[PDB]
Symmetry: C5
Amino acid sequence: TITYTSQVANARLGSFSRLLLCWRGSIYKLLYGEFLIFLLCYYIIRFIYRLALTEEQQLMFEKLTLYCDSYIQLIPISFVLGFYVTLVVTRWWNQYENLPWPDRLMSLVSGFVEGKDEQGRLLRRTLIRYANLGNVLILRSVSTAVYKRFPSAQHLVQAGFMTPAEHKQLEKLSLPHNMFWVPWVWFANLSMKAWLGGRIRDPILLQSLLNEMNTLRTQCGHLYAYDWISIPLVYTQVVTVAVYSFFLTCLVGRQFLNPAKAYPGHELDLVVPVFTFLQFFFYVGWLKVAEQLINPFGEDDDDFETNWIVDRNLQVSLLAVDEMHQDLPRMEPDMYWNKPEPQPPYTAASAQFRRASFMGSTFNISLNKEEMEFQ
Amino acid sequence: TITYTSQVANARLGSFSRLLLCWRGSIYKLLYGEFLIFLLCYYIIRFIYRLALTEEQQLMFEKLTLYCDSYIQLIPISFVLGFYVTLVVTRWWNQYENLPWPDRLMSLVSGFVEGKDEQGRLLRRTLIRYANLGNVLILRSVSTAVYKRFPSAQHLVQAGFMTPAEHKQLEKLSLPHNMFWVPWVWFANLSMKAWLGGRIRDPILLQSLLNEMNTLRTQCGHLYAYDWISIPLVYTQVVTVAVYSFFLTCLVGRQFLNPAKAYPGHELDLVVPVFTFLQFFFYVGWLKVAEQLINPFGEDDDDFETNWIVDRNLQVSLLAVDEMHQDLPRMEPDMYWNKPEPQPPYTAASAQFRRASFMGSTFNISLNKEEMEF
Amino acid sequence: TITYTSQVANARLGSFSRLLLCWRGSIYKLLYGEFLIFLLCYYIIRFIYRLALTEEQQLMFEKLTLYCDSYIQLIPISFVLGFYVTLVVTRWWNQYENLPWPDRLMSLVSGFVEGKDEQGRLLRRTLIRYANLGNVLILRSVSTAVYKRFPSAQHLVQAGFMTPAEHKQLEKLSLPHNMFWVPWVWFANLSMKAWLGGRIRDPILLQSLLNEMNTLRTQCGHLYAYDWISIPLVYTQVVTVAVYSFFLTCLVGRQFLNPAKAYPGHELDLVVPVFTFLQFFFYVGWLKVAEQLINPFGEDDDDFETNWIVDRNLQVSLLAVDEMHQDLPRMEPDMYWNKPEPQPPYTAASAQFRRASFMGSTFNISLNKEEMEFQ
Amino acid sequence: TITYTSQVANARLGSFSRLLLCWRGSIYKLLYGEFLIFLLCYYIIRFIYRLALTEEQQLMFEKLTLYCDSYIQLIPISFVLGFYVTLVVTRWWNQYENLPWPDRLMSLVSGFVEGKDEQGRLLRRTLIRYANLGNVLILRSVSTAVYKRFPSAQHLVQAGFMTPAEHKQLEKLSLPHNMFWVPWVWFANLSMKAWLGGRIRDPILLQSLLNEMNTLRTQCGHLYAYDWISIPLVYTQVVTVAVYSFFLTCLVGRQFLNPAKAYPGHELDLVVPVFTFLQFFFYVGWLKVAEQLINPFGEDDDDFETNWIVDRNLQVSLLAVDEMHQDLPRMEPDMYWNKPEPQPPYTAASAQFRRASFMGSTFNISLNKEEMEFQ
Amino acid sequence: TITYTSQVANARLGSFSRLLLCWRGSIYKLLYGEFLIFLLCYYIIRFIYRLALTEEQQLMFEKLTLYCDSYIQLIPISFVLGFYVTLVVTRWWNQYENLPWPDRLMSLVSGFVEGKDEQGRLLRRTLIRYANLGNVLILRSVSTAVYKRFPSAQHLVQAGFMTPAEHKQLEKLSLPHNMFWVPWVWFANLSMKAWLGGRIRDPILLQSLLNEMNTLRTQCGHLYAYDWISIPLVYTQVVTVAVYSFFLTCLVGRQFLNPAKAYPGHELDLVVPVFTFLQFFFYVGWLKVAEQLINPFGEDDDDFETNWIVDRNLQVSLLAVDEMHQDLPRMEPDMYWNKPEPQPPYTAASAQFRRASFMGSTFNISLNKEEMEFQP
Ligand SMILES: [Ca+2]
Ligand SMILES: [Ca+2]
Ligand SMILES: [Ca+2]
Ligand SMILES: [Ca+2]
Ligand SMILES: [Ca+2]
């Protein structure tokens, strides 16, 4: 994930242009090899036309160039790229929104499951660890960085996500499918055991816990679905064929023909097709947006930082359910205890943001006494 | 389902280019018959023009070809194709999102329904089997592969989705509609009997069970809806006529005329219309996207693996409610029992992914002491 | 509703082409009258130009034809048709998704409301009949087929959706608005009476019943909303003006001029403007998609079968709450009672769909022993 | 709101063309002033060019017209208008979907809150009046028609939405913000008091009541959000600049030049630029769609009838919670008491809609005997 | 936030035209620096072409101008601009929808948590203050204005959002990540203690409280998500290069060439490229839409008033849970106590809006007696 949110907070003078001086997660990084190949092919064709063809062969090449340039169309490639990239971006943000965060569940585990002794602490840690284990199982199923971090379940055992007893239980329950769903059944059974043991005082709390757990399960299932059900290969190939046919046609039709031939549109040989190269920039960078975002769990610069998410979830969950259980700050009256209208101060750098409230768009409507009387 | 998610994990040099070498679920596999018909018709017309027409007939055909190639641009084949394919893809992903997964329900059945004896085990298995039976009943109605697997309800009995008593009950209750809804009423009544029998301790657990069951019911109803309410035939016909008329026109207008006639754009006889073939691949593959995805429950390569989903759901549900009921790993202190800041290790192949925490975009804003004062 | 889902299950050779031989719900059925009018006008103009115009008048008409052809543009009509038809299709599917199905509610009524005697059976039937009555009350207000089936509330009484007592109560509660909301308040009060009478054992079951009932209420309110709040008339008129002005100017600009005058683009004098007729096909069929789908409760072929939905809902609801209440099949051990990994058989026609499980995209990642070691 | 749903129920011959004969909510009504101004400017420029310019000035104006005709492009204006109008229509329908309807809440108040005496009736009426008061408080802030109906809170007192005690309480709770949220806190506290007083039998009914109330609160907050957070002014100005610059350059570039000069495309002086006027109607009507729908709570013909919604909500809510509380029709066996398969009759005008059930697309799949045996 | 909702209530004559006379949040305010740079470069190039080139170089510049004017159409600025700006606007409204509002939670805290004494009042205030501290903790992380208001957690202590005990507790629990999630765990534990202490009468009310709190948690997490996961930089750079290359090309190709050369399309020297300037306004304002909306928590005119939202949420929440707890207006019969059909009056300015009810589109369908009878 490349974050530039701070750099585009305000629409200043050339705010987006200053982003052109970036390299990580940039279009140059994703485009330099393709552009070098295209440049080499274009100039090889140019040198063949100039220094390797006879006059009749050059005339044939010029007719071919005009014929090709009559075929280079902007609307179809732009439309297919726009629709495909919109689909890819929608799926990319949906895949992000299905990344499981145990924060609601860890709050409910810290609150509902009672006991400051070793048994209650162990129970809360085990529940939140089941949640984190399910999350890390689906993430190592779908993310290449997480899989490189945990190539096997024994790596999960050595990393503390899974105890050896849990690993043996998972091996005993082995089915010819992905077994990421198991910790959710473990969570349900352990929560039922906790309620029957008195650690959960009411079944309302048990229902809330299992509702948050099922929400996490649905998110992990959506992650598995997006990893499994790819965008259909035919649509990807359609967009690739559109872009590649466009620039294969440009490889010949955008050649600078001999200016002495007085061909319309070929009155100035600039050697470098700056507009064709700009088109390559735009269209193949539009394609590279989709190429980078089609699997946002790879190892691109703009791909999701799933290992950081895993570590943060584990640390925050364990802290919330173990150290922060019934460990509250002292409850004391606040600054506005006797003030019916609080007014927090503004700094010197923020005093310009103290704005009057919006009372509705109809507040300033002016009416006379005659028209404000009820009929 | 053709999965290539691993091949496109990173945006490498020609990551989408290597996908053009695939055959299953590809443009070529979906397109070779149409392309062969187009090729044969194109070259039949070419040989008729060049070897079977008189000079006046050749001149008439040349004028017709120029007219067709002039008016080929009148056919909108990118707007309607784009919007129609977007609609088809949206509906295809919605149809996937309504595939029922009993995982939440199987967790709730494994937990809430108590009893390690034969009666409680039978009750849990019967409830989860009602869920799976409803799912398979809607899938054999919406999917051709599942129907080929279960042509009759007796096939469902012989496959273990239905008992003979359930089949007799379904035959007795028969109405002149699709009866996929029956196992949901069965689940509701069996769960009510379980709660009244003490197997479910509180009615809130019963409410949660029936909420998950109703979620599965809504998903199956949406599957039936997508199978029933097709995309309007007029829109499909518009797109189909657009594409096929474009290429029926290209059959004549993209012919290479006589180079001796010195027609503008026809001075060279290239024999093979390479750009017309690339346009054919692009446009008719764009149509084939919609053709393959309009019914994602058929037998295409990129259609849903519904038989696998059925088998996996049955196995996982039965295991979760039967073997995994109150069967937990031993609860022991973890690796970070006395570590307030856990830090799982990184491998040598993953040490580069250890990133610092993102603390918000405003973290690095620098303010002097004068402007930081209230 | 015209269903062709079985015909397009697989992307076979010309799967969409076999859909061109259909008449019900087809483009020809929606287009033949407009196309006949357009063709008649086009050939009237052609005969006037060819047989009833002087040479100076013919030259004037040729200039006018060239001018009109120069002013025929495809970009704006295509854009407005795409956006408008996308809006219409989205609204059409949302209108379908708001069709109330009582299946969840009928399951809850069959389960929660206890009693195998006449009183409990009557209570369950009355509750599910209130649900069906609300659905039919909104449907006869939004659907012309249902209104033709039930032109009056007395027709609903004669059809069994309303008892005479319910009709008298509805007439007593008459307000100058649509009274489709009344059965929901009836359902709430009858469910409260059932819970107070002991027929509903716990108030949480009552809450679930009223939640499903409120979901049906929201769906019926959305149906009323879509019937009431039409797509703005200005947008519809804009699209209609675009399409009809396009083809009014094609009526003159697409005329075949005299090839003897050697006009650019008029070298070949056909009689049938095949490309103009194809454009009429595409654009007026695109418009007819919106014309058919703008009110999906009319009597078009592709409109919703709301009478069938009403009949099916009534039958299924009454069967579920009356005959299926506590009427379960005998609970016996299944085929896989002691089999830990069930393997349902495949037929000969389905053996090719037996697939290995997808274990995640990272399953086949290969790493060496050195790089799989924790640092 | 202009409703034409009944007129477009079926896709008949010229279904959308008959909607061009409308005046209320029409494109003509929204466009006639702008079109008159454009007509006047165009013909003033024409008369200046033809009667008030010297021959050299006429040649300069002809060159300027030929220069202007090149800068008249359709793709950008169509693209921006399509996207902007799609955004406006999406926001318009979302603003409709956040119009609060108390039907679910009024059903729950009629059911859960018990008591046929004066205290229970007063409690139910006051609760539903709090709901309606919150709705009207947000509506008079976001809608100009409601504000013209209730210019002040005293107008709400005189209209029965607010009692004098409630008005004094609202004056006491005055903060420098919009106070539409106050009736929700009132509802929560009064419902808590009702549960403590025995009028609500179980806390789960109280939870359902407050859930419906919070749904109404979220809808009203979304209404306030849409009234406050407008579409960004830069985007509205971008679309306005595109449209009006297009037609400002059409004022000169679409002038009919002198036919004697035989300019390309100017061989015919038709006086009236019919196609330019059609483009004006189409594009500025596309803009007027956004202009009308950008604030759907104004006083346009297609804007929401919020005063009717207010009146209907008040009447229906008071009737549902007061007169319809525990006032049910007599519970008697229906028409299909012992009939297992109900079959309501069809009229002579609806008998053609009796359709056989759709059993799934795979019902008609034919397989021979050999391919049905399990392997 | 620039609000012009009142000005566009009705589609009057030139309703959008009057919006062009605005300055705050306008095209001009976001555009004038780039437009001045473009003007300067355009006229520098014009003066170089006219007064600083020889004839053999003027011919080359004229050929280059004709070439650029011919090939300016190759830049697909409209397509990528439209798709990118649509994405930015969708994300902008989604970012708005995840701004947390404590109104549902403050209603539940005011109702469920009982006690008019000091302990119950303190408990309600502390719970609602935990919700508002979580909101302000995420907002000072995602919004630059809120961060300028609260550069440190000590500023939150001095502003009343956080007590010194809460600040010490937050420092004790410190983790290397952002700690906006802590007040949610505090709320859960304090609500559990309140239920165990009898201040919450039933666990159903506790579940409702924690449901509203978790909804606020999800909204704040989505705010953090949008602040973290930016729109991919490659797409942004594509759009930026499209616009900037289009106008760098227009710098040369839109030059008014010498009319003595009688070039087609360059026979009239207007000096000022009015249509090129209109294209600049349109295209770069379309870009500035995305530039302003890509981070809606900055300090632009149309960015969200997050400081006002923070202050309003704090004031309204504290008032709702403290002063308004069990403080109800006197319950008395209303105006329509014995009126079966309530009819609120209309003013003279609103009597035109008294409209009849819509009974359904099928109400006016006319059928004769023969076709209305049920088929036997
Ligand atoms: Ca990637
Ligand atoms: Ca298929
Ligand atoms: Ca219709
Ligand atoms: Ca308006
Ligand atoms: Ca900003």
